[PDB]
Symmetry: D2
Subunit: 123 residues, 4 copies
């Protein structure tokens, strides 16, 4: 089915992710291979956990989000988004994300969160 989250996706940065089938409650797992890191550590495949809303009846794909638990950094990213299918059946996940760094003190919390967007296409 078009825009099913399950499967292999790639974003404009060259990152890849695999999403599992959805459980009955719309929960899913997956793995994320980022192309880029703000750290200087070697990148390792990392697990993700999320949930997607059940589909409506208006020809629109439901919203979803997940958390990436990076295996090589102390940071955590969450992504939230919605899939779209164009005229030609090409699927795209439009996503926004927040990347949270682990900071030394509460006084540094103001600087801890970066934000961005990604677009994923089906591999």
């Amino acid at each position: 089915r078009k825009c099913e989250l399950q499967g292999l996706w790639r974003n404009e940065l060259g990152s890849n992710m695999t999403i599992s089938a959805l459980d009955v409650a719309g929960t899913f797992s997956g793995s994320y291979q980022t192309a880029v890191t703000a750290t200087n550590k070697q990148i390792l495949v990392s697990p993700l956990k999320g949930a997607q809303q059940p589909p409506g009846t208006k020809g629109q794909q439901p919203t979803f989000g997940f958390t990436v638990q990076w295996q090589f950094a102390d940071s955590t990213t969450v992504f939230v988004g919605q899939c779209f299918v164009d005229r030609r059946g090409k699927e795209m996940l439009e996503m926004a994300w927040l990347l949270r760094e682990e900071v030394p003190s509460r006084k540094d919390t103001w600087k801890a969160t970066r934000v961005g967007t990604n677009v994923f296409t089906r591999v």
Copy 2:
């Protein structure tokens, strides 16, 4: 233990959330009772799914995130953050969030995502 995610939390908006114990992989579930909605629907307790990094050894709490699958809206929120413990042992979760609305077309994606911050204290 201080800053253990498991338990009952409340934010400045008056929202409440319960977080489960962490599984071995640092995955957790929970429920979220928001005080506020951008919709005009009646608020219903909603499930959450997330993951937390394992703790370091520097006296700092690890980062974490989760997804809220709202039971009364087509939207999805993700939250990402870090707990802090003050001089007096009062715990606070410092969080940033993105709220994603389900939009009718890809051309409306630009307007689909709101952003904010919350601070949770232990109930």
Copy 3:
């Protein structure tokens, strides 16, 4: 003059903007013709006001930001970004933005702010 902000730009949504010459302090003015709106109002050209950092000497273009005072809406947008010149000399402004709605009370501030990204190319 590569990556000189002064001039005419268009982003991926079809929005156009004109930036005036920078004054000595790096402040500038301009106009912004958005292709899209979250309102049901007729879009009208709107003024912008901003500032850019002095160029450094390392071959990297300086960061800059601006505010757009929409003439057809009660909201305000801020854009912040940096210009890049590709291998062929083509200029792109990579920007992130926040769109702030005017809300009826303080309790409503939580839902007031949308976030996104745009890329502009020279017209």
Copy 4:
């Protein structure tokens, strides 16, 4: 003059800012003394430039935004917000911000932008 931007403000991080009188077009200037920095540089007073919407007639203060050109860093911040007067007449600016780092290449743009919120009270 309740919620008149002109004047002196301090936020929860200890930052101070002075906003000049608004000109007829609602544009303004000012200075910003941040208490905190993501750099290891000595903080220096920095100029801001912004704009505010014309007051409506519904008893709600208009949205506004500004850019801060940090004098001690290569980054730029944009703030966007709205003033509120509480039951006792106390004014608070509820603001969200983006802090854009200058990055060495375009490929690095993804990590360039931090986001957060501040609340200002009249000094």
